[PDB]
Ligand binder design. Sequence first.
Ligand SMILES: [Ca+2]
Ligand SMILES: [Cl-]
Length: 255
Amino acid sequence: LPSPTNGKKWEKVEQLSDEFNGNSIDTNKWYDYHPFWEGRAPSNFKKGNAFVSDGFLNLRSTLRKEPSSVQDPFKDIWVDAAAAVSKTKAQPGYYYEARFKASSLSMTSSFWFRVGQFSEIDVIEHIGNPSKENRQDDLPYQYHVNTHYYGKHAGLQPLGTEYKMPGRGRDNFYTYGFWWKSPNELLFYFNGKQVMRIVPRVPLDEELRMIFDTEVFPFATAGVANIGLPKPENLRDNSKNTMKVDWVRVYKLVD
Ligand SMILES: [Ca+2]
Ligand SMILES: [Cl-]
């Protein structure tokens, strides 16, 4: 963990931390779907595609139906995505870290915060294996952070940055850290080293929910590039279709 500030101690926030080592998801801590959003067409989150087993929260994306069986593969739903959403709220001041290996799909493998009135904080929205071939050289190595603004702050542009990792997200368990240090200062960490900083456009002083999810992007939107639609062949392969979170750990400072 970062050095705690000014004589304070880090204490684990138990309700937001999980080693994911049980036989099934802890329903006290997590929805195994997104209770307020069906997901990003042509994907929709499916209950239980986020499941705990084998030491992981597994966020699996599967084929609902062939893309050739729907009228428009960019819109009609054909991918069953995965989401887990926290039941306890994420707060300013906490440190958050998740150790995960991305899927090998042309979909996100994401760790982020939303379910707010005006703000979103993205720790990482990793594109494990873009089907847009000319992005295969860069996106698999990218750790991209972001902030979004909506509601009373609609119209502000996102504000984020990125870090080039030494290996692909789909090939490695890496530990992505985020200190919500102030409403006006976000610090991001890669394997315990500070690598990025964002000063949000307005103070991020509302509570949010923590999210792990997977999404198809039918085109560039929501701060994510044009990545291409996923391939059925990969969606059918359980060795390629699953983002695996070994653990998430959250801490707060106590006086
Ligand atoms: Ca684990
Ligand atoms: Cl794919």
